[PDB]
């Protein structure tokens, strides 16, 4: 293959003319690799010419698939290229990464087959800390915090986060708002909260996996979380990192129906009924589940909790076990200890 290592970025709030890929139909959030195999001779020649010149293409996120009209889009720079003639077709495989977000100022159809659009690159504005306008001069030296410790011994690092909130927003008492309000507009705090509520759907190591930059982290989270497309356009229209992070929190807190994986169509339970009295997710109530096997209580973690095998109704795959009480005076009577990765939360519509 052919690897390109140079990095270029057009100036923000400026116009540029680029061709539009017709095969692409989804919104390519910047930072997300979107490999594509091109077999149309005109498209292949255009891609080769672009890779020779700039290796920059445009992807238009149409709001309506039938209408194919987009008020916003993205620019993609090719990271790897490999064009080979296989089975009589000059197929070119290109792995590209989004670089900038573009609003379609004017798109017209070129005679070559592709459509050329002149668009102005939207500016991704980055904001200073909310306390920089009012921070006391003497308290400037107290802005740097002694690192970010984290360990299982600290568990939730609760005291550390109170200390951070109390030290960073100390001057919020000069203003009509309280510190817990400014903490709702902090980039670090919102990144921490997104990490925390993403650990409850998967147990990945987020101490290295997720970026430490609000812009990069915001795009990565916008890419990873599973929703429909139109809300992805909505998240794309956002022009600031803080607003994008807040929108992502709103979307994550909007979805509460823990649907199955595999199926991605049935509703196992809801986040409202979480039997947090006593890893695995405990649900006090459940529906649309099939229980089988025998209540084998051997080596049970929970005293007085016998469990049986479970499946959805159709997926027939194990998602957990409905622990049942082994004593008459035991509450809850039946609680489902489902596996975290066996469910994919979706918007409860």
């Amino acid at each position: 293959m052919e690897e390109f290592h140079g990095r270029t970025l057009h100036d923000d709030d400026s116009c540029q003319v680029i061709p539009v890929l017709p095969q692409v139909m989804m919104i390519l959030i910047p930072g997300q690799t979107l490999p594509l195999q091109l077999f149309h001779p005109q498209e292949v020649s255009m891609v080769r010419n672009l890779i020779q010149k700039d290796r920059t293409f445009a992807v238009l996120a149409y709001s309506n698939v039938q209408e194919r009209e987009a008020q916003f889009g993205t620019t993609a720079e090719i990271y790897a290229y490999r064009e080979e003639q296989d089975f009589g077709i000059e197929i070119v495989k290109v792995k590209a990464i989004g670089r900038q977000r573009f609003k379609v100022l004017e798109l017209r159809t070129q005679s070559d087959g592709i459509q050329q659009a002149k668009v102005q690159i939207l500016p991704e504005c980055v904001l200073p800390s909310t306390m920089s306008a009012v921070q006391l001069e003497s308290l400037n030296k107290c802005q740097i915090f002694p690192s970010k410790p984290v360990s299982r011994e600290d568990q939730c690092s609760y005291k550390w986060w109170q200390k951070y909130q109390k030290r960073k927003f100390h001057c919020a008492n000069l203003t009509s708002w309280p510190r817990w309000l400014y903490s709702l507009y902090d980039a670090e705090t919102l990144m921490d909260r997104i990490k925390k509520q993403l650990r409850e759907w998967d147990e990945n190591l987020k101490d290295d996996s997720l970026p430490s930059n609000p812009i990069d982290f915001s795009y990565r989270v916008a890419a990873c979380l599973p929703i429909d497309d139109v809300l992805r356009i909505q998240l794309l229209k956002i022009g600031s990192a803080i607003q994008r992070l807040r929108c992502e929190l709103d979307i994550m807190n909007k979805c509460t129906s823990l649907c199955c994986k595999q199926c991605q169509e049935t509703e196992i339970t809801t986040k409202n009924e979480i039997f947090s009295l006593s890893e695995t997710l405990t649900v006090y109530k459940a529906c649309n589940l099939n229980l089988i096997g025998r209540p084998s209580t051997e080596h049970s973690w929970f005293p007085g909790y016998a469990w049986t095998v479970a499946q959805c109704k159709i997926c027939a795959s194990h998602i957990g076990w409905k622990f049942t009480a082994t004593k008459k005076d035991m509450s809850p009577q039946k609680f489902w200890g489902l596996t975290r990765s066996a469910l994919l939360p979706t918007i409860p519509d």
Partner: protein
Amino acid sequence: MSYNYVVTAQKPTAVNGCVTGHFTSAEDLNLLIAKNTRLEIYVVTAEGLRPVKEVGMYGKIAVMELFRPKGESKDLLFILTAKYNACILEYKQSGESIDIITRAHGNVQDRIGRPSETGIIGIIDPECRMIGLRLYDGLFKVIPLDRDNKELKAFNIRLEELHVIDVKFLYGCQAPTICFVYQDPQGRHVKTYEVSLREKEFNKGPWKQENVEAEASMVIAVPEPFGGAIIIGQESITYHNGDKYLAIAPPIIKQSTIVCHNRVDPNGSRYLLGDMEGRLFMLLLEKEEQMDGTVTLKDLRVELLGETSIAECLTYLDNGVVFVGSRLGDSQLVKLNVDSNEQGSYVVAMETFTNLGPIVDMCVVDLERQGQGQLVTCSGAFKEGSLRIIRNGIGIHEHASIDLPGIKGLWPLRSDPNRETDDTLVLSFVGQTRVLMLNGEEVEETELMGFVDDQQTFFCGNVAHQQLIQITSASVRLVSQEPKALVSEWKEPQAKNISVASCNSSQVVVAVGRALYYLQIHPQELRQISHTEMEHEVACLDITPGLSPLCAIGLWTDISARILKLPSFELLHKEMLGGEIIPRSILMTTFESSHYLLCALGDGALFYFGLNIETGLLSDRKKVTLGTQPTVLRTFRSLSTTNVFACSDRPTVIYSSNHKLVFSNVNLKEVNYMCPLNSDGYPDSLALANNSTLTIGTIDEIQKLHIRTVPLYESPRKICYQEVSQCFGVLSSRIEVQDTSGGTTALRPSASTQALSSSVSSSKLFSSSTAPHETSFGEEVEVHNLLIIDQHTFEVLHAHQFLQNEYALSLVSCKLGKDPNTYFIVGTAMVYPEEAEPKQGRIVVFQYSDGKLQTVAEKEVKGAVYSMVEFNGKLLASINSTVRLYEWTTEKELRTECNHYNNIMALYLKTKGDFILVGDLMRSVLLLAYKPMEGNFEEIARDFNPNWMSAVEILDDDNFLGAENAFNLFVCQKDSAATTDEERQHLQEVGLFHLGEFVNVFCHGSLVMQNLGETSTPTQGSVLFGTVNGMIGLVTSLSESWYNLLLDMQNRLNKVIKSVGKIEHSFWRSFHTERKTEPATGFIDGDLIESFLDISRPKMQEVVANLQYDDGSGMKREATADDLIKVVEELTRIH
């Protein structure tokens, strides 16, 4: 398209850095204090601070240090601006004129670079070889100091360590070395570099990279012979000098973080240290090891000198006097008599400078005069929060007090050789007239031989021909000066009682009934000169001087003013002044730098008029409403030119500035009669008496805002006014610690633990709740209260404490629905540390009746009620993201009516008519309209622009004003164009301005009286605003022609006026933001325009060299430099 005008009615007060040096003179000890732009230069004297100059700089003073380069007598002053303007100022006075010249000026900004989060650091070589500046991370900008470096040409030097906390230049070194503490993943280190100007790059430092505490806060460079550095954090002070290393962990600095420092000895043996909670330590250096002539440290003892204001910049003046300048408290002057030990504290306060502090909410209230507003602000924070009542009135400083039995008139009588002093004042009692003689402060009343003992004398002045006349109703008695005996008696032919007698320098007129008699004073004799008859009785008469060319009389039967010939009986002019009541005082005054005669009616209203000294009478119809009580206008010599004091229920002082009179309200409840008395006891005084008693004292110059402070020892957050209840309602926060016995303990006796009727909110509408992460020992918890503070004594009448973990946010007093009574509606929010965005809140409706705060209503909402206002009898709440409209039922229970769900957080609610304006911190200004036919909100407009927004206000149905990041002000405007049914949905941004302050609160109203003036004023409306630093502003609109004229005049003044540091005006006022900068538009700087009256007439001439001036015409002459004086004088009255 907006045409605003922004002015400042109170300069900023929050001190953000002070420094002492020999600045004004080679021997003086100065003290320079910067506020934002107000560089105040004081000279330290024995008693305290004597102000010397106060210069307004075109920027926010972010760096200020006095240095003396080799070869100079007095120090210079390097000042850096938050917009990166660097200037080197020098003091220059020529006998009487004082000027701050600029020896070098430049802009030290970089094209690119993220500004350092720890902020600008500006440090100077002790040998004055360079100036180091940290502006952006990983870059140290060095400014060489040369006589030919007039542009301050600086160069960068890369720093290998990005996270630099504090950096300083060391003492006793050959090459300029810097030492600094920096943060790396390993921890916190201290590193030293050497700086060479030739090579223009760092070198090897004298020391080695050491390791310090994980929270080592700040560095302090110790002078010779100690040398080295001291690094202090939160639990240890460590002194490093290469091979030497001392470390101390005292058990007294554990409670708080040292934040400020200063040096009290020239040889650096003792240092002053102040922390966040306002406590003053003292670091003592022990040099007991003089082993080889040199001095080395042995011990590092830390004392504790007591407690002061919450310090921000200490400074040790001479003789144990410290200026504890406070940013959120109030600047002090504490005396460190370290041998006092009165109660363990070695500090005793001396002075206290007013500091309006972090204004967090204000309200305009018509408290007393019922005509002019009074601002009430929740100032300060933590242990020094207070309420400030700000009023616009000419202040009277009373120095003497005395009790009189309802005296209704006094007059100074001199019975001694002329020495500009009167040893006695005759007071008019009901039936008699007892004259009190006071060589010192005596109160005994002594009867004069030449004055009638018990006759109720009316006029007793300083007659001519070395005589004293005591004219009464019975007879006029003239006594001599040296004989001091009755030498003349002028009895009327009918022996009747004269109602009102007019007295002059040598001519005396007595009016009895409808007849009048004029007489001339003669040496030791009284001679009647003429007699005359009038159509109606003479209620009042007074001829103002010599011989008066005219005499003014008020007709008792017609209530008309007639001016005639005083030494004759020939009438000149007459005018029926309304006729509502008989006038009670008519006089002619020269206070207008001309001849003018105004008369006061019995109802207090005065009809202005303009007299002629030689011959001629005019009308000049103009009404001034002093009040609703009879007024006896007088004049006092201790004045600018003459002044005119009108004593009434609302006393006023009338003074002319340029061509129009100004009636400034006095700072007294009510005065019945006043008289000047420039006696030995109180020189330049004015003795005033009321219905209660009498007093004497001096009067301030004019219209200075007076601020009354009411301490609370808490943090006040909000304030409203309930008119019917005659009381205020203020939310406040008190910080408490977690107690070992289970519960919370207060640090100090606040203003909520010391209320009359203290209640506790028990309406636990919910129960249970969760807190798995329970609070531990030593944690700080905020407890909120609603205080009901009075309007006269300013005492807390009730302190209703809310639930636990409940932050009470908003507060409104209104008459909901159709109820005849008012309520205090408070919206709260249950906040627990585990939860991030609160989920539970309340809207609790109190009603303060009969001294008890009874909770009338109750309501639980699924969110936090951020803001609340009132529609026409319907509450309008903002719960998290939704805007809800509550209708108050008859059963006394708030009932929901309609909802409007937003994608933004409804955080700023401001309404007028039916237009609602909703905003949040990200400047998502949004508009809504209430449709009565449907009952649901319709979104009319929208404005989204990511940026930190601080406040918002409605100016009109069209203009919406607001504050914005980097201390800017903006103004949006709706409608116009109406092109494609989508432009009306958008808010055009028309006005931009760089105010230079962080606005907290916007509120309508104004602090001037409501004299209508028929034609009104060009400025329409008035919006006060209050900022963190403590200034009160004022935004008022303007007509388009006025805006064009004042913008052209602003452009013309920019070329004539000279700034300090030579910062061009248009760059100071450009809309500044970290990413883009655009010129100001739609805003007129009120300060610059009002500075047009300070420049000289020769300088005023070329300001108006070729202009139009309009004024119902074209381009008449060139405004003649007097039309614009009229314009600016009119513009000055607004604030």
